[PDB]
Design a binder for this molecule. Structure first.
Ligand SMILES: O=c1[nH]cnc2c([C@@H]3N[C@H](CO)[C@@H](O)[C@H]3O)c[nH]c12
Ligand SMILES: O=c1[nH]cnc2c([C@@H]3N[C@H](CO)[C@@H](O)[C@H]3O)c[nH]c12
Ligand SMILES: [Ca+2]
Ligand SMILES: [Ca+2]
Lengths: 316, 316
């Protein structure tokens, strides 16, 4: 079993991912670390604790992270995407399970130091906790096995505005710290995940399936689906976070390109992710020079990824 | 005959374009306006005057433009792409023809005001003179028939650094003024022009042809081709400026997408061009909201464009 920490802002697609992850036999979830984005950090913690209970694992530690980005200020949340409670307005009763005392940043540092080169991190929201752990401990990047990030828009439009994807826009400084940390990083941009969908028919197939969490997953996805229709004009949902989980277990369902990634932190392009492919010899040095390259998902085998996601969601 | 002003920084591909333009029948070149970029403004004026003489038209007015970008400061020139003299180190004797007294900005306003909705502008370098014209006369944008711009990198890597294309990076503030002016604008990015090449074999075919300027064009192209081999790893040249001239006469050899274009003026992404395609309904307003969209070249019919360029370059 491969040790995994999920850094997340649940979140409708985050919740689908977490529930899938608990059903994956090759994976050992050693903890959930929470962040803002789809909902405030407190709302993310509440949902993560509820997901642990729903999965029959209330013993799995939940470590609350940062309430704001590194630059500060109360963050704007995607409630128009994920609902007021972050899970499509189900307004569920409060969990009995409680979060651990330590912060998400401290939990990440402790578990990575406890098991060097063994713990993988799946980043599903803004990268604040991951950046805090990199800054607080300089050996973190050498001790973490792999960091799989759902974030960015590589040579494609963003989803917050034309320039930026939501997770990166949520904390641009944190994303730039993570992408230049020298750790073994895999980034999956929305240029990849918007190709991997569940249509209205696929969602109905989920409702009618014998899946353990089928009824709950369908109720959540109703609000998520309606946003895609109003904004993207698509009758269904984009599987952003489940696709990044698929890259953890089955990287062979994708192709990757190596290259230095930088994040714009100011101006009209705040949150924009840009990769230097290294196929052109520049005349002079630039902000992409001297850093260690990372892996950027380039193509996706959509039927294989959809088959893997559907089998986990529809498992009894 | 359609009236045309060429705003240019000659420049090797600029020189190919200017010489093609003088041979093109459905066009009347009413003037050349010069700018920095490939070489300093004074060097661009010298080359433009030499091109008018070589074409047998020393009477065609040459109006010298801005020596530095809108924000000020001595500009960095692409002498590693176009040579010390701006024309591949041919070190030709000085022209006998002299430039006009008025600035490029004043010439642009005067000729567009003289013939409202008749004069087209082909922009081959940084957009400083065009922006100065828009700022000095706020009706300029509405009076120019069309502005065809060679510039930007749309959902592709830049050629200065991963973020920016050279002409836009030369004056980001000027490009942003032009793209938001409300004028009838057609932008041709390097995402289009890098698909339209002359290989080493094609250049040899040009040398062996009966073309009026074949010998001169080939000598000048030697330094230009060499940069492509050292930097891009391509044995030949990218026809950037001749392709934008092809978009003036034959826009039917391309497909275009309508959308608001903004330019980043600060940070690591200074000079980055980004278009909002308008295919997604945004939840809130952004820097792309409220402006008039422009036409962005999306695809190119490479054989048709190559055929048109080759027939002009190889005409006796
Ligand atoms: O349209 C959207 N706007 C903002 N955030 C999201 C999300 C969330 N943010 C990430 C994708 O931007 C992903 O992790 C998901 O949990 C999905 N769709 C949208
Ligand atoms: O590789 C390059 N770096 C900088 N400028 C140029 C140019 C010039 N600048 C424009 C394309 O960036 C184009 O108008 C041309 O005259 C060609 N190739 C390069
Ligand atoms: Ca998420
Ligand atoms: Ca030029």
């Amino acid at each position: 079993r491969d040790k995994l920490i999920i850094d997340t802002d649940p979140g409708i697609d985050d919740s689908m991912t977490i529930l899938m992850a608990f059903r994956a036999p090759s994976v050992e979830i050693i903890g959930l670390t929470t962040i803002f984005g789809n909902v405030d950090t407190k709302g993310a913690t509440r949902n993560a604790l509820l997901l642990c209970e729903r999965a029959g694992c209330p013993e799995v530690p939940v470590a609350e992270g940062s309430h704001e980005p590194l630059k500060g200020g109360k963050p704007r949340v995607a409630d128009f995407v994920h609902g007021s409670d972050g899970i499509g307005n189900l307004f569920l009763p409060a969990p009995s399970a409680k979060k651990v005392e330590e912060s998400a940043a401290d939990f990440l540092i402790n578990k990575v130091s406890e098991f060097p080169g063994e713990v993988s991190v799946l980043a599903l929201g803004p990268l604040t906790n991951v950046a805090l752990a990199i800054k607080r401990d300089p050996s973190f990047a050498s001790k973490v096995k792999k960091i799989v990030v759902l974030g960015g828009a590589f040579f494609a439009a963003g989803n917050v505005n034309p320039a930026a994807e939501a997770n990166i826009h949520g904390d641009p400084e944190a994303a730039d710290i993570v992408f230049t940390s020298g750790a073994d990083i895999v980034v999956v941009g929305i240029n990849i995940t918007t190709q991997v969908c569940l249509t209205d028919e696929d969602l109905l197939e989920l409702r009618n399936s014998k899946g353990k969490h089928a009824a709950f997953l369908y109720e959540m996805c109703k609000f998520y689906r309606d946003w895609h229709a109003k904004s993207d004009g698509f009758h269904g949902i984009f599987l952003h976070d489940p696709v990044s989980f698929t890259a953890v277990l089955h990287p062979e369902y994708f192709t990757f390109k190596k290259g230095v990634v930088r994040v714009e932190t100011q101006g009209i392009c705040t949150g924009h992710t840009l990769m230097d492919q290294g196929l052109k010899k520049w005349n002079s040095e630039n902000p992409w020079s001297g850093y260690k390259p990372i892996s950027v998902a380039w193509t996706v085998d959509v039927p294989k990824v959809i088959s893997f996601i559907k089998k986990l969601l529809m498992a009894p």
